[PDB]
Amino acid sequence: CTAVNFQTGSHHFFGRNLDLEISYGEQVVVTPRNYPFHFRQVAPLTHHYALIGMGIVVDDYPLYFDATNEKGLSMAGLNYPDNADYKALATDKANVTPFEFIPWVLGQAASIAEAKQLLTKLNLVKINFSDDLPLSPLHWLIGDTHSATSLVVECDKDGLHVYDNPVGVLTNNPSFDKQLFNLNNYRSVSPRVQENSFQPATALNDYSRGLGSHFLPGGMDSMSRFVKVAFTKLNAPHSATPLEQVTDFFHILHSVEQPKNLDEVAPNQFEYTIYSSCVDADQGIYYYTTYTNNQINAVKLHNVDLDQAKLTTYALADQQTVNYQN
Amino acid sequence: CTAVNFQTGSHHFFGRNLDLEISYGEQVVVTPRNYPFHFRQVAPLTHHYALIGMGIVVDDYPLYFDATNEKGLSMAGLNYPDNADYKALATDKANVTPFEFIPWVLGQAASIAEAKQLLTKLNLVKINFSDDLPLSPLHWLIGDTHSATSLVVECDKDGLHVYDNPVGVLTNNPSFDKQLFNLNNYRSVSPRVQENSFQPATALNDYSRGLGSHFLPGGMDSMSRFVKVAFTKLNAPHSATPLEQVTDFFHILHSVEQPKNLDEVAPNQFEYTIYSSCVDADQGIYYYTTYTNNQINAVKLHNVDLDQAKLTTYALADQQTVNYQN
Amino acid sequence: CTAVNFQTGSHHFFGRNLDLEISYGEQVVVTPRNYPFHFRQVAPLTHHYALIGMGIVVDDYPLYFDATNEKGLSMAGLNYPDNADYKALATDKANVTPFEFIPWVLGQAASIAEAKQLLTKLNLVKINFSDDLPLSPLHWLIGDTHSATSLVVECDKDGLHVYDNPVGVLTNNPSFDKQLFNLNNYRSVSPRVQENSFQPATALNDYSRGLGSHFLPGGMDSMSRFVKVAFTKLNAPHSATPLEQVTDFFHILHSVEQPKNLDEVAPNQFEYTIYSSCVDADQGIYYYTTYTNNQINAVKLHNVDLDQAKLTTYALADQQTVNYQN
Amino acid sequence: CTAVNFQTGSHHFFGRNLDLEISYGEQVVVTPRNYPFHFRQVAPLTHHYALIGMGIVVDDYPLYFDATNEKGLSMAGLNYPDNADYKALATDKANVTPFEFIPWVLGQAASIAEAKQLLTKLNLVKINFSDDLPLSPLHWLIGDTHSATSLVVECDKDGLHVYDNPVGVLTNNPSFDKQLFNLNNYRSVSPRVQENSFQPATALNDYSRGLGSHFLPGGMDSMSRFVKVAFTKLNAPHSATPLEQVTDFFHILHSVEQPKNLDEVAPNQFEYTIYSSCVDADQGIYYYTTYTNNQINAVKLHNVDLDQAKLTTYALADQQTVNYQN
Ligand SMILES: [Ca+2]
Ligand SMILES: [Ca+2]
Ligand SMILES: [Ca+2]
Ligand SMILES: [Ca+2]
């Protein structure tokens, strides 16, 4: 998985690749303001901000992979195997399950600054959604429309960690302190061909455009994708119009998509990028591609009656949709 | 630039990324059988195989970047700076300019076997199209629908070279013997997590899916893209229908697209993937995406009257085309 | 700097490269049992285990870079810039300066088990030896002759950390959790040529012996040296005699020596391996080479009267000493 | 194998690592001026320049791995598997066997310029020394005391190649055009920490000295050792005295020695650096270390009666020779 919080030209785009070996029946899910969220161990949110994101609906409950609220606050949950350590109930904390975490934050917080207030009280508790659907190990990226900031939330064996993330990207393991530190090793990677420091008197031929990034990683693994997406995001252009910025964002995410069949997780099982999302967080527009359809599709939050109480779901436009010009 | 010859399930797909710092006004150009091909130093081709490909029409003439003929033979010209060496007129040989080379081969030859016969009589002559447009340094990939074989044509200072290319990919510099040899260094890269050979008694954590490709290159440079596209192409799935295979092909080419602004070629100039093409060579369908529009577009060769004599051109659908689902 | 704890055939060898840009006048220093160790903030050690190691005698006091006591316990202090955080005096704890730390542990403890007991009461206090010589930022490797265990001691801003280190090597930054984790990325490196997993159907030439370690790091930086020295140490042979094992040990340390002038730390200043040491910890024999003399030199702890109270120092044999055979 | 031609301060040092899985009984062999060389297919050299180098003596004939003559011309033969292609007899060439090549050149040539005259006539012929001792596939590095030049001689399937080699190093496969070209990919490696070009606004910590060489190869394979030894040689210091320059040379060669047991060539067989040589080519002094003895040993050409006709051989000082200081 890869998530990116991208800010250009006063605009804010947030989204992710979902990389998995099997699809769970993903849909774009709009949760209106009056859908009642009845949490296991904290106070209910029966009126709250509307949400749009990708998820599945089980027992009429929206299980979000990622979402953005009507105020521009976004979250994505990304696989964090072995490191995630959910906790026992704590009598002096807000006890929230990992499947409730996105609705709990996004339903009531409008900014990263406000989300930080919730995070100071949070205890992520080890309660399964159902006996059929045990908890996935996750960590989260959070972005908003009010700062250049991103947060990374990692609940580890030693406790809850909340990191500032100015780079604005996240993948899978290792924990964020190790992941971010690794960028230090790539300081010499460049968009330009560097000076010959190997030995200036030795005739080294600048034989290919792009030689500046010769040591950039391109593997399917979490650390390689973190480095590559950081370089790609940090060197993105600053386009003039919102749709061009969306196009730029998709080029960032697709730079670290996992194609079939390059990441084998089990015999006859390959992890690949099921979908790539980009939310225009200012407008509430959820754009996405899928592995099977290259055309960008969009669902507009504000085309739904946000005062309803029922979920609205859209099946993904999953079939390759070609424009036949003659 | 990157070009790929991809065969799966009786079907043949051939296509390329065009990576440049500026667009030249590219269009899909269909040259029908009776468009007369005039050459600077050989007899004209007044009746020939029809061609479909991407190019520029300059005055009255189609200057192709890549093309496929009605018999399934494909060619793409890719940047080959400094290594390309075009020749003086040779008395005993067919003297063809690099800009006439695609029409000359594809107009006459129906297969790799026939193309090889033409290449034994070929001299690529240093003659500019005009004073305006001097010759570009190129090398070529050739594929067909009769073999799992690709050819690489490189006209170097020491003469013309024609290589067998079973891997079926090509980028830019260096020459193909050095480029193909470099794959030997990546033998240990894997779709699956390899056994711990560093020291089996040491507890090394398999902490990320995709760790098998941890050492795969991801840079924008020619050698990095060659390695990555080879690994991605050689590990592609075998899908059931031609449209799904086209989708797989685009995931191969997009694995090594060059995003803005990661490859700086000069101050304020960045080489990026202008378009990516995929030709179904058995049906003559030219599919493409562009940097600015993610939807796949298609032009069908056989929707044109191939007995005409005039060119048929299609402007690229280059505006981002979103499917709004609500 | 690099330190290694190496065990083979019932024997224990411990030693280090000292990498600095300038030499400080290092000598082999034997501190006998009755040299009184005076400390700034704890009781003196008037009778203690004897020590042998490399250091500087400043006024009357031995400042050790590394040492081994008469019971087989060894310690080395290695540069740990920016991460080291020495502490204010703590009322409940043994307040020991970083320059007293080696005498404090090795003077009292005979094994890792006993050293661990001392570490539970330790506070490394920020007290300079003098205004002339301010404290250096360090972390420590500890080994013994009773286990195949090494300890890493790192006093960071968030407190004192003591890690188990089965691999038995240490360099400089980053902290040991990040450093040890990095070995996971090198699981596929091998002493032998690996199977072709890039694509088995593609003819990849096994063109060089040693291709199994094609991705092993060779740079002068701390993380590169950690990976290379780990691979080299973990794949060392098991030789029959102690002197042959010493030879094997020096090949391990020299695998990551820093030659002039490959590591520039400032204009006209290059960090290089001043000396490499190997202590036979069971016999108390301190072997070393220097950058300027390739012959191994040795000082035997037990050739000194260990009941004395005065220091015994040996100047390094640092002039290149050639055996002329004719 | 690795060979280096090193020039500093008006002095010339030439030498090599011999990397093999088994020792052949190597000795330092001095061939005096009147030892008769009776060649298979060219005129005899019964009076010629004296030679010193490492070799074996079989049937009273010196089979040199490497050698230097009394005029300062040096050659080393290094393993070149599969690529070496020795030829049939040629009636218009000087037909010289690969085992005669070093005596044939060094016996009669005093400079690279003179050796070039011999190379224009050379045909390396496929004649075994004996049925017991078939030819090894080799390529050669040549240096002298009159230029900064080195030559590389490679007899390939397509013919004899003689390359200029200003870098002055050589290992094993691939052929020299591919080997030297590979240095282009390492232009950004540096003795100093490079500017942060990954993204200047992103806080990348310069956390380790030596980070400039983070991407330098350290593997046991031929291409890795070529890059590492080139960087190490090209960044060597310029020491003031001959013996210091010899010490510097050994640090260059030892930077790419192959330790046991990191290069497995067959079950229970590991290729390792049997010896490392350094010839002061101006003085005729053959210095060497061995895997088993770290002390430098030396044989002086001019301590032998060079007007004799019998070979003089010295067994290597192979046992670890320690200087016990107390
Ligand atoms: Ca609120
Ligand atoms: Ca941690
Ligand atoms: Ca002569
Ligand atoms: Ca060749």
Side-chain angles (χ1 to χ4, degrees), chain D residues 163 279 286:
Chain D
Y163 298 88
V279 189
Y286 193 101

Side-chain angles (χ1 to χ4, degrees), chain A residues 19-21 28 30 79 81-82 172-174 190-193 205-225 228 231-232 235-239 243 246-248 250-252 254-255 257-265 270-271 273 285 287-301 303-304 314-317 320-326, chain B residues 28 30 79 81-82 172-174 186 190-193 205-225 228 231-233 235-239 243 246-248 250-252 254-265 270-271 273 285 287-301 303-304 314-317 320-326:
Chain A
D19 302 340
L20 299 165
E21 75 271 29
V28 177
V30 169
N79 185 231
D82 313 318
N172 308 107
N173 288 346
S190 186
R192 300 176 307 276
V193 175
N205 182 353
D206 162 18
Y207 71 87
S208 172
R209 314 293 80 72
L211 259 181
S213 55
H214 178 77
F215 293 114
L216 190 68
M220 303 295 103
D221 59 299
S222 175
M223 294 194 84
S224 302
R225 289 185 282 100
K228 172 136 201 200
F231 184 72
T232 304
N235 287 279
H238 298 270
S239 295
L243 195 52
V246 170
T247 302
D248 294 332
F250 277 108
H251 284 295
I252 295 170
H254 288 147
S255 78
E257 78 159 18
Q258 294 191 245
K260 299 175 183 177
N261 279 337
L262 281 61
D263 183 354
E264 186 164 349
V265 306
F270 297 88
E271 168 165 304
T273 300
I285 302 171
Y287 300 91
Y288 70 90
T289 63
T290 67
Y291 201 82
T292 55
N293 182 18
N294 281 62
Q295 178 176 34
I296 295 167
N297 308 289
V299 176
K300 292 186 172 195
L301 174 62
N303 280 0
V304 176
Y314 304 90
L316 300 196
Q320 187 60 269
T321 300
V322 177
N323 172 40
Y324 291 97
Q325 280 179 263
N326 69 348
Chain B
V28 180
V30 171
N79 192 38
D82 305 310
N172 308 108
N173 287 342
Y186 295 88
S190 181
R192 54 181 67 80
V193 175
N205 182 358
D206 170 8
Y207 70 89
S208 170
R209 294 165 155 200
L211 212 46
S213 54
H214 180 72
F215 293 115
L216 191 68
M220 300 296 104
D221 60 299
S222 173
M223 295 195 82
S224 293
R225 288 186 283 99
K228 173 137 193 194
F231 184 70
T232 305
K233 181 256 191 204
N235 287 277
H238 304 264
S239 302
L243 189 53
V246 172
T247 298
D248 296 329
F250 276 109
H251 285 295
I252 296 168
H254 290 148
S255 83
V256 292
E257 94 165 357
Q258 297 195 240
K260 298 175 185 175
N261 277 340
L262 278 61
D263 182 354
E264 190 168 341
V265 303
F270 298 87
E271 166 166 308
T273 300
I285 304 174
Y287 302 90
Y288 68 88
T289 59
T290 67
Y291 200 79
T292 55
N293 180 22
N294 282 63
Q295 178 173 37
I296 296 167
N297 308 288
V299 175
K300 296 190 185 192
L301 169 63
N303 283 9
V304 174
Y314 298 91
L316 301 200
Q320 186 64 268
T321 302
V322 175
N323 169 45
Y324 292 90
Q325 278 183 270
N326 70 349

Side-chain angles (χ1 to χ4, degrees), chain A residues 1-6 8-120 122-309 311-326:
Chain A
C1 301
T2 303
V4 175
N5 184 24
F6 180 58
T8 185
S10 189
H11 299 157
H12 305 84
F13 304 94
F14 185 101
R16 62 92 58 75
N17 291 337
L18 181 67
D19 302 340
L20 299 165
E21 75 271 29
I22 188 180
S23 158
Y24 284 72
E26 300 80 31
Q27 302 186 77
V28 177
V29 181
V30 169
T31 300
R33 295 163 179 150
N34 296 308
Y35 176 87
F37 278 118
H38 289 294
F39 299 109
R40 303 293 167 101
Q41 301 285 339
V42 296
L45 292 175
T46 60
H47 181 84
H48 54 76
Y49 294 132
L51 318 176
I52 186 169
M54 199 76 80
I56 63 172
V57 180
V58 177
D59 314 334
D60 197 35
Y61 188 90
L63 292 170
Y64 276 113
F65 298 110
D66 45 83
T68 297
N69 73 16
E70 62 179 276
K71 296 301 191 169
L73 189 63
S74 302
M75 284 170 78
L78 286 74
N79 185 231
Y80 190 47
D82 313 318
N83 288 302
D85 192 67
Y86 307 132
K87 307 297 182 185
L89 283 176
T91 63
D92 66 335
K93 294 291 194 177
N95 295 282
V96 179
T97 78
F99 64 85
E100 294 171 334
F101 189 31
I102 295 178
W104 182 72
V105 177
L106 296 195
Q108 71 187 298
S111 63
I112 276 171
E114 182 174 9
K116 274 161 69 76
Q117 300 291 334
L118 296 174
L119 298 174
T120 71
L122 171 72
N123 181 53
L124 285 159
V125 295
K126 194 181 179 156
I127 300 171
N128 292 327
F129 176 82
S130 66
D131 295 354
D132 255 354
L133 213 51
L135 288 170
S136 296
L138 296 176
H139 62 173
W140 296 265
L141 187 64
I142 307 181
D144 75 2
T145 56
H146 295 291
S147 57
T149 317
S150 314
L151 300 181
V152 172
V153 181
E154 280 169 355
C155 188
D156 292 351
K157 283 172 181 81
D158 66 355
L160 180 70
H161 299 265
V162 177
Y163 298 88
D164 186 40
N165 180 12
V167 171
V169 307
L170 192 66
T171 57
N172 308 107
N173 288 346
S175 303
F176 191 68
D177 62 328
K178 301 187 179 78
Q179 190 77 288
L180 183 66
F181 179 87
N182 184 49
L183 295 187
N184 294 332
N185 294 318
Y186 297 88
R187 66 182 292 113
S188 68
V189 176
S190 186
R192 300 176 307 276
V193 175
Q194 305 96 329
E195 70 177 350
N196 170 9
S197 48
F198 187 92
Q199 207 283 277
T202 293
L204 296 185
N205 182 353
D206 162 18
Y207 71 87
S208 172
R209 314 293 80 72
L211 259 181
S213 55
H214 178 77
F215 293 114
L216 190 68
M220 303 295 103
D221 59 299
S222 175
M223 294 194 84
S224 302
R225 289 185 282 100
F226 186 94
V227 179
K228 172 136 201 200
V229 82
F231 184 72
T232 304
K233 182 259 193 197
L234 292 168
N235 287 279
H238 298 270
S239 295
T241 71
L243 195 52
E244 289 175 310
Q245 297 156 4
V246 170
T247 302
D248 294 332
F249 187 94
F250 277 108
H251 284 295
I252 295 170
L253 273 191
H254 288 147
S255 78
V256 293
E257 78 159 18
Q258 294 191 245
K260 299 175 183 177
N261 279 337
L262 281 61
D263 183 354
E264 186 164 349
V265 306
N268 316 295
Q269 302 214 294
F270 297 88
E271 168 165 304
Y272 67 96
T273 300
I274 293 171
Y275 69 83
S276 294
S277 68
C278 172
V279 189
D280 180 330
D282 286 299
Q283 307 302 317
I285 302 171
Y286 193 101
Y287 300 91
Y288 70 90
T289 63
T290 67
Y291 201 82
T292 55
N293 182 18
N294 281 62
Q295 178 176 34
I296 295 167
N297 308 289
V299 176
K300 292 186 172 195
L301 174 62
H302 296 278
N303 280 0
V304 176
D305 185 351
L306 296 192
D307 297 319
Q308 284 169 327
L311 303 172
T312 296
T313 70
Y314 304 90
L316 300 196
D318 67 304
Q319 297 199 288
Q320 187 60 269
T321 300
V322 177
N323 172 40
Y324 291 97
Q325 280 179 263
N326 69 348

Side-chain angles (χ1 to χ4, degrees), chain D residues 49 108-110 114:
Chain D
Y49 294 132
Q108 71 187 298
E114 182 174 9

Side-chain angles (χ1 to χ4, degrees), chain D residues 122-302:
Chain D
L122 171 72
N123 181 53
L124 285 159
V125 295
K126 194 181 179 156
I127 300 171
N128 292 327
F129 176 82
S130 66
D131 295 354
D132 255 354
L133 213 51
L135 288 170
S136 296
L138 296 176
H139 62 173
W140 296 265
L141 187 64
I142 307 181
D144 75 2
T145 56
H146 295 291
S147 57
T149 317
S150 314
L151 300 181
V152 172
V153 181
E154 280 169 355
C155 188
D156 292 351
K157 283 172 181 81
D158 66 355
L160 180 70
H161 299 265
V162 177
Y163 298 88
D164 186 40
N165 180 12
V167 171
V169 307
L170 192 66
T171 57
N172 308 107
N173 288 346
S175 303
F176 191 68
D177 62 328
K178 301 187 179 78
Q179 190 77 288
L180 183 66
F181 179 87
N182 184 49
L183 295 187
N184 294 332
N185 294 318
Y186 297 88
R187 66 182 292 113
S188 68
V189 176
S190 186
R192 300 176 307 276
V193 175
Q194 305 96 329
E195 70 177 350
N196 170 9
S197 48
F198 187 92
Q199 207 283 277
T202 293
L204 296 185
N205 182 353
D206 162 18
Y207 71 87
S208 172
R209 314 293 80 72
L211 259 181
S213 55
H214 178 77
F215 293 114
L216 190 68
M220 303 295 103
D221 59 299
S222 175
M223 294 194 84
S224 302
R225 289 185 282 100
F226 186 94
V227 179
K228 172 136 201 200
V229 82
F231 184 72
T232 304
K233 182 259 193 197
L234 292 168
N235 287 279
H238 298 270
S239 295
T241 71
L243 195 52
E244 289 175 310
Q245 297 156 4
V246 170
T247 302
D248 294 332
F249 187 94
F250 277 108
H251 284 295
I252 295 170
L253 273 191
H254 288 147
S255 78
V256 293
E257 78 159 18
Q258 294 191 245
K260 299 175 183 177
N261 279 337
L262 281 61
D263 183 354
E264 186 164 349
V265 306
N268 316 295
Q269 302 214 294
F270 297 88
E271 168 165 304
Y272 67 96
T273 300
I274 293 171
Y275 69 83
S276 294
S277 68
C278 172
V279 189
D280 180 330
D282 286 299
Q283 307 302 317
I285 302 171
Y286 193 101
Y287 300 91
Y288 70 90
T289 63
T290 67
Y291 201 82
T292 55
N293 182 18
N294 281 62
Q295 178 176 34
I296 295 167
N297 308 289
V299 176
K300 292 186 172 195
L301 174 62
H302 296 278

